Design a binder for these strands. Structure first.
Ligand code: ADP
Ligand code: ADP
Ligand code: MG
Ligand code: MG
Ligand code: ZN
Ligand code: ZN
Lengths: 49, 638, 614, 267
DNA sequence: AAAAAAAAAAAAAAAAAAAAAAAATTTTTTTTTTTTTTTTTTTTTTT
């Protein structure tokens, strides 16, 4: 945890980051609802099987 | 076959509630009448007032505004069922019917800056300015194929999975038969729907001054594709959703959000206008057919005292003349141009703002605030297709409207010359090598100029006091020199009027409070009595709304000059050209050409329209003659 | 869902047993004769008239309109099957493709084995052996649509649209059926092309190569392959049919075969054709689904209005001694007076006669300098509408690259092509330059060069060329050596108040405002169509100056030059102007020899134009 | 959705011809009376005499014999339409009306020995003795599920892909809702079909002396499951087809064959 | 008629031929968008 002073020289538009996702299989259509995404700049590797 | 749904309690309840809401015979009948109207007009979208839905059923309103997709599906199923009940033959023509919304959205009425994640899957109403408007592409929803080898015909159905998970099998376009025979797609039998994507930006005036704009992407499906163009102010109501990405074993949390518009409406709700009102207008026209024009003129700008002839001319402008499109394609303009050249503080700017507030399609331009390409059309390159595109300017937008040019005198000679074609023939001819275009701008110009030296020096001729050339002045059909007369009696009149207007207070709404410095309440620009009550503090007067409606109805009428008025106007024009028409010590404020005869004809036609005459009679001709006589001459003192 | 074999038989019946009296009441079997010519290879394109089809089978026309591409193919196959039974003699092998077709048919007959069943992939593609094209002339019942109104509901439909051509590419070779030759089997592979692109084949499918299990690589050939002339134009909405506050919309028309080289930029064209999509593969689409671009596959392009492409009484009116005055009067009748300026504009329309003994232009340049509100812009606009090839420039809206050319990124391939501005589009036509005196100095220099050299020498950074702008100039301005030295005629129009003249003008204008037409006169003014026809008939009537006129013309020139010298500008350009104006008058009179009356009218026009300056 | 045929000329012609044959009213109503009799008896399998079918339309007879599945489906559609026309409520009661064949099969009449791969996808009438039988098992043709969490009721359908390409999607039994809500199957509401497998061996008194006997596997379904027991000299009229193998990746090219019985007869 | 021997059968155990099941992220590409630079065009200032 860090506390720093600065000045904001830009601010991107507000976009939608998923906190939960529901992934459905193409073959059997079964779902894997409510997969907890990590917070911040980070991605998720979908299950392969 | 797969997992079909046998019975669904929530869907059944929703469809029953929506069908009940749509069936209105024990109730007033608004929506039964609306469905009948759309049947008659051959449409497949119904605009349902969220206020009415909330009034008849609060639960359905909350459900529709908080979970829109399936709720709108149920509503559209109910709509199709109701349309089938009214008439099944028409219901069979269209595969589906759509439910657009309107009315007031409490917290769902947001700007592109305020349209955040919290409104995902909800119905939202966003008002903004269009920036980008892609091409209308056809999107295939049902493709017909033919196999020449086996003579078979096939139909492939593609579901609208814009925001739902889509698998490749859904989107596989077939090309070969089961045994690899070639398939030919039959375009005449396949089904395509128009699709477009636009961008809505936070309105520049409503957005915070400091920060950069915020925009939202809007998908318009069939029936909503060419409703908006870049630069327009529009209200889009629809579902704010998330767009699926593409197949991939890795993903960032980021999602691309859009708005699937269910209805789009113009900000120019004032650009468009009951039997009670129609009969009221008829009786108003019939009763006092002679002084109606004068009454309208006096009531035009109630907050400005005097300026009787100026207000008459402004009324003539708002009415406009009658264009003459000849058998050979020749064009004679019908609009009317007024130049208020005046001393400081004589209410010319206030007249401009009045016309801005009143007239439909009124564009405010300033001297140096709208230069060249910003004032007329322009040509640019897409920068993506490397192709040239037109961009409408102030006057192209104001086509069939009015342009209020404040501080017209202080426009560059370049811009003033560029405006000549718009003034005369009402069009902008612009070309770059790639693209040449002839845009229509049949606008009427209302200019507010101050004379050279600041204040009109009455010792010098009007030609000298007006720092404009005769070629430019001839463009303005009416030219009014508005002096700040130093008469103590008129000063008393003006001071009394001003102080009364400053003392006026709103009826009941206000009791001593301060005017406030918007999303909380419905946006007025998009919101859905012959005489005023004779308040003594305002009068010591036709109603604004009735004046608007009457002017709208009288604009369409097309009076035709009668031989008597033609002879009178011709004789008066000959005299006006003659030298005797101006005595000694009187100077012409603008040279008299055939443009002034056209001015006379247009003013007489405007008067006849004010009276709904259907014929421009000697009364109208004499009024136009008198106004021209007042406007085109000035008495210079020594 | 219909039996396409039955539809093919129906179209065959129509083609074989349809007839009309197009030739002086002589039943000639129009489409039978066209089929004869197609078989003889004396005709490439066949235009089927859906009006003719509906004359007997309206429901077939409805089916065609609902699904044109399918029925286009059906008609093409019907014609293909019909050609052999109409063939009467041997084709002369017009071209290399004809040689290839005859070779392929000969060797197929040689290796026929008629009873043997051949694999479907073992035959010549139909498009590979056509040498003809079939297009539809839209039915008269179908009202023309509007580019904006032609939407997804019209996909695959035979729509007819009207508009202005804002751009057209140059005829390029587009491959219809790629051909390949193998390095092992000596058999030809074919690949018909339907997509905008394609992947060239690598391995050969020939029966011999498959049997031998050889590598069988094959090479793409531009020789045996089939191409078709390909043009891509952009048509634009007419001004009169655009929404109130909207800019006109443009549609991409694709022209192929005999329809190319018909429409050039600026033309008013009515295009009948099929509205079709183009799949948008590649782009990472925002919205899932088979979204596709759109275009108009052209079938019948016609020129409209000024772009358009006689009876004994018509010849009588031409021969009438007053024909010149009639033509001068019929120009912009709603504008009162200005009879002499109307005559001058008629002469500008007709032109002189170009001579290349050092090439001296035969164009006539006229500059109407005048006081405000004297019909200058009205006459400019009337000429713009009248002249078959014309452009109009008002002020600085179309300035710089709007008058000259510019380099623009092409689309069919992607590169720097040259797009012509107003002057280029007016080439061999007329350019109406309103508000001349206010134009920029660079544009004025360009007009100066155009008025004498008929060229535009651009040497900017991205461009270095010399455009051809052989356009007459009709300029307008308000109040000069810089213009009087150059312009052929400089006409001053001052509106001096006068009771009688103003009264007559007011009566004329009031009658115009009343009845949306000019007041009746002794003779009915001629329509724009008839005027354009007569102007064009005059253009190709080059007369010559006899040796007799030399002395008279020289005397007139020296006299007028003495007048100019004495008074407080005459040059060789004055005599050139007299010559070309006299030649234009002779053209109007339909004689091959310039006469004393021609020179007299030329000098009278010059004298009155100069008198206007005083 | 997916591909849906609109103009199948062959299917339309087959349906028209089969309905014309089943009309029979002018042709002394033989099959009209048979349809009425099965309606009264509460049966949903029509036995058609191939000799009468050939006499009426030899083209249809040959097409049916040489193309079993397609023509049988067309015949069943025609039979269902005819049953609806005679009595609609019964047609709605029974989803699919089956057609079995009978009569003189010129060459298609064979034994388990002479039944070779030349008869695949054809109608064969094989004689023999039932060497063994299997228990009658129910295969779910339409399952119904109820979700307590949402009170929803879904119904999944499984097609008869016995001798057709089958994918994991078609043969997955739902056990959760889209939100991972456990389901409960409504056995009473679900639709099952009885299915049995028997083995027909060449009759010993007919087999060549001293050789081992030739067998064939036969599949019986609803209304034919218990038509025979071991030791029954039965005549099975059916369609000879190759049974699909399990999803592999490497195939040896060997395909088990089987006879989908459309009719079973005893002595 | 009863005892012993022979064989005949039934059932259980065992070993291959064919078929069926299980296990499975990382590297490279391209598209968009955004910025920088050049030249032409337009605008403004001074004489
Ligand atoms: N005749 C008048 N009647 C009413 N108000 C007037 C009149 N003349 C001046 N005023 C007041 O003086 C002010 C002048 O402002 P404005 O009209 O914007 O400038 P200008 O009069 O120079 O166009 C206005 O607020 C207006 O209320
Ligand atoms: N001699 C005339 N006869 C008829 N109408 C005229 C005549 N002169 C001018 N007009 C009318 O007056 C208007 C002004 O003419 P216009 O040509 O626009 O002015 P300019 O000459 O400055 O371009 C036009 O609408 C035209 O119809
Ligand atoms: Mg002001
Ligand atoms: Mg002009
Ligand atoms: Zn799965
Ligand atoms: Zn080969």
């Amino acid at each position: 945890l860090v506390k720093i002073p600065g000045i904001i020289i830009a601010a991107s538009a507000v976009r939608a980051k998923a906190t939960r996702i529901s992934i459905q299989c193409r073959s059997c259509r079964n779902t894997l609802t409510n997969i907890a995404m990590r917070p911040g700049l980070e991605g998720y590797a979908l299950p392969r099987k | 076959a797969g997992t079909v749904v046998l019975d669904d309690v929530e869907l059944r309840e929703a469809q029953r509630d929506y069908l009940d809401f749509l069936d209105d015979e024990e109730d007033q009948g608004i929506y039964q009448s609306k469905v009948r109207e759309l049947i008659s007009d051959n449409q497949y979208r119904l605009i349902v007032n969220v206020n009415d839905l909330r009034r008849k059923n609060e639960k359905r309103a909350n459900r529709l505004l908080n979970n829109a997709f399936e709720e709108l599906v149920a509503f559209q199923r109910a709509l199709k069922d109701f349309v089938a009940s009214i008439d099944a033959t028409y219901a069979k023509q269209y595969e589906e019917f759509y439910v657009g919304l309107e009315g007031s959205f409490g917290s769902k009425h947001v700007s592109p800056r305020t349209l955040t994640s919290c409104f995902l899957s909800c119905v939202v109403c966003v008002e903004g300015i269009v920036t980008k408007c892609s091409l209308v592409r056809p999107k295939v929803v049902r493709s017909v194929h033919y196999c020449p080898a086996t003579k078979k015909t096939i139909e492939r159905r593609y579901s609208d999975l814009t925001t739902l998970v889509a698998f490749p099998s859904s989107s596989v376009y077939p090309t070969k038969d089961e045994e690899n025979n070639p398939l030919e797609t039959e375009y005449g039998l396949s089904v395509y729907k128009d699709h477009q994507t636009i961008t809505i930006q936070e309105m520049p005036e409503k957005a915070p001054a400091g920060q950069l704009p915020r925009s939202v992407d809007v998908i318009l499906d069939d029936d909503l594709v060419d409703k908006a163009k870049p630069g327009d102010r529009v209200q889009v109501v629809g579902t704010y959703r998330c767009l699926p990405g593409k197949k991939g074993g890795y993903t960032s949390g980021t999602f691309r959000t859009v708005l699937i518009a269910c209805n789009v409406k113009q900000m120019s709700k004032d650009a468009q206008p009951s039997a009670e009102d129609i009969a009221k207008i008829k009786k108003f026209s019939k009763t006092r057919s002679k002084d109606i024009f004068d009454q309208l003129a006096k009531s035009l700008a109630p907050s400005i005292h005097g300026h009787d002839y100026v207000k008459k001319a402004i009324l003539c402008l708002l009415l406009g003349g009658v264009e003459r499109d000849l058998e050979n394609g020749s064009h004679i303009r019908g609009d009317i141009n007024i130049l208020l050249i005046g001393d400081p503080s004589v209410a010319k700017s206030q007249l401009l703002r009045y016309v801005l507030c009143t007239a439909p399609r009124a564009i405010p331009t300033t001297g140096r605030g709208s230069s060249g390409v910003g004032l007329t059309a322009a040509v640019t390159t897409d920068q993506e297709t490397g192709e040239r595109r037109l961009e409408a300017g102030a006057m192209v937008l104001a086509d069939r409207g009015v342009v209020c040019i404040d501080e017209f005198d202080k426009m560059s000679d370049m811009d003033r010359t560029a405006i000549h074609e718009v003034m005369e023939q009402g069009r902008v001819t612009i070309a770059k090598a790639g693209i040449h275009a002839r845009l229509n701008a049949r606008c009427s110009v209302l200019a507010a100029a101050n004379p050279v030296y600041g204040r009109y020096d009455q010792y010098k001729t009007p030609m000298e006091n007006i720092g404009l050339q005769d070629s430019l002045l001839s463009r303005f059909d009416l030219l009014f020199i508005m002096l700040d007369q130093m008469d103590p009696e008129q000063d008393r009149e003006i001071s009394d009027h001003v102080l009364r207007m400053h003392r006026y207070r709103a009826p009941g709404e206000q009791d001593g409070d301060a005017m406030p410095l918007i999303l909380a309440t419905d946006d007025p620009n998009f919101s859905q009595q012959i005489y005023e009550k004779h308040d003594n503090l305002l009068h010591g007067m036709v109603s604004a709304a009735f004046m608007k409606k009457y002017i709208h109805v009288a604009k369409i009428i097309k009076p035709v000059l009668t031989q008597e008025s033609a002879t009178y106007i011709a004789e008066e024009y000959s005299r006006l050209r003659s030298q005797d028409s101006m005595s000694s010590d009187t100077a012409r404020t603008s040279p008299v050409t055939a443009r002034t005869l056209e001015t006379l004809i247009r003013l007489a036609t405007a008067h006849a329209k004010a009276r709904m005459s259907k014929t421009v009679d000697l009364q109208d001709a004499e009024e136009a003659v008198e106004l021209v006589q007042y406007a085109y001459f000035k008495k210079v003192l020594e | 869902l219909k039996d396409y074999a039955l539809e093919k038989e129906k179209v065959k019946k129509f083609l074989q047993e349809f007839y009309q009296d197009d030739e002086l009441g002589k039943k000639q079997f129009k489409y039978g004769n066209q089929l004869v010519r197609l078989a003889h290879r004396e005709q490439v394109a066949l235009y089927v008239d859906l009006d003719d089809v509906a004359e007997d089978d309206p429901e077939l026309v409805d089916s065609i309109c609902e699904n044109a591409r399918r029925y286009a193919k059906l008609f093409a196959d019907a014609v293909q099957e019909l050609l052999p039974q109409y063939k009467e003699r041997e084709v002369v092998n017009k071209d290399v493709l004809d040689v290839y077709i005859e070779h392929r048919l000969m060797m197929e007959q040689r290796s026929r084995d008629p009873g043997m069943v051949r694999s479907p992939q073992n035959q010549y593609p139909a498009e590979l052996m056509r040498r003809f094209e079939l297009y539809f002339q839209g039915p008269s019942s179908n009202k023309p649509r509007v580019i904006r109104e032609v939407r997804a509901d019209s996909v695959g439909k035979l729509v007819t649209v009207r508009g202005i051509v804002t751009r057209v590419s140059e005829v390029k070779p587009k491959m219809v059926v790629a051909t390949y030759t193998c390095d092992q089997c000596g058999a030809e592979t074919y690949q018909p092309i339907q997509s905008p692109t394609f992947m060239p084949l690598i391995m050969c499918p020939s029966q011999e190569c498959q049997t031998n299990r050889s590598g069988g690589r094959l090479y793409l050939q531009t020789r045996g392959s089939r191409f078709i002339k390909f043009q891509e134009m952009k048509m634009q909405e007419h001004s009169d049919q655009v929404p109130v506050g909207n800019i006109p919309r443009s549609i991409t028309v694709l022209v192929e075969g005999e329809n190319t080289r018909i429409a050039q930029p600026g033309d008013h064209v009515s295009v009948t054709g099929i509205f079709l999509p183009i799949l948008r593969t590649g782009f990472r689409q925002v919205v899932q689904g088979l979204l596709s671009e759109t275009y108009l596959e052209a079938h019948r392009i016609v020129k409209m209005n000024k772009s358009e492409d006689l009876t004994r009484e018509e010849l009588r009116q031409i021969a009438e001694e007053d024909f010149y005055e009639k033509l001068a009067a019929s120009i912009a009748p709603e504008i009162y007076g200005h009879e002499d300026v109307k005559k001058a504009l008629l002469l500008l329309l007709v032109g002189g006669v170009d001579q290349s003994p050092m090439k001296i232009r035969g164009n006539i340049n006229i500059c109407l300098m005048g006081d405000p509100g004297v019909a200058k812009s009205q006459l400019l606009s009337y000429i713009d509408r009248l002249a078959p090839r014309s452009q109009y420039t008002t002020g600085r809206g179309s300035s710089g690259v709007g008058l000259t050319a510019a380099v623009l990124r092409d689309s069919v391939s992607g590169e720097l092509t040259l797009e012509g501005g107003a002057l280029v589009l007016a080439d061999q036509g007329v350019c109406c330059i309103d508000e001349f005196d206010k134009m920029a100095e660079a544009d004025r220099t360009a007009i100066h060069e155009v008025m004498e050299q008929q060229t535009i020498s651009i040497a900017k950074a991205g461009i270095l060329t010399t455009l051809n702008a052989r356009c007459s100039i009709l300029a307008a301005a308000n109040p000069p050596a810089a213009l009087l030295s150059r312009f052929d005629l400089l006409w001053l129009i001052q509106d001096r108040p006068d009771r009688d003249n103003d009264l007559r003008l007011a009566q004329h204008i009031t009658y115009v405002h009343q009845h949306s037409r000019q007041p009746p006169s002794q003779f009915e003014p001629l329509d724009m169509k008839l005027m354009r026809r007569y102007i064009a008939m005059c253009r190709e009537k080059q007369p010559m100056v006899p040796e007799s006129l030399a002395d008279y013309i020289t005397a007139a020139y020296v006299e007028m030059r003495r007048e100019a010298w004495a008074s407080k500008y005459t040059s060789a350009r004055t005599l050139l102007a007299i010559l070309r104006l006299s030649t234009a008058l002779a053209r109007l009179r339909m004689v091959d020899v310039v006469e004393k009356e021609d020179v007299n009218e030329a000098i009278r026009l010059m004298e009155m134009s100069k008198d206007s300056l005083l």
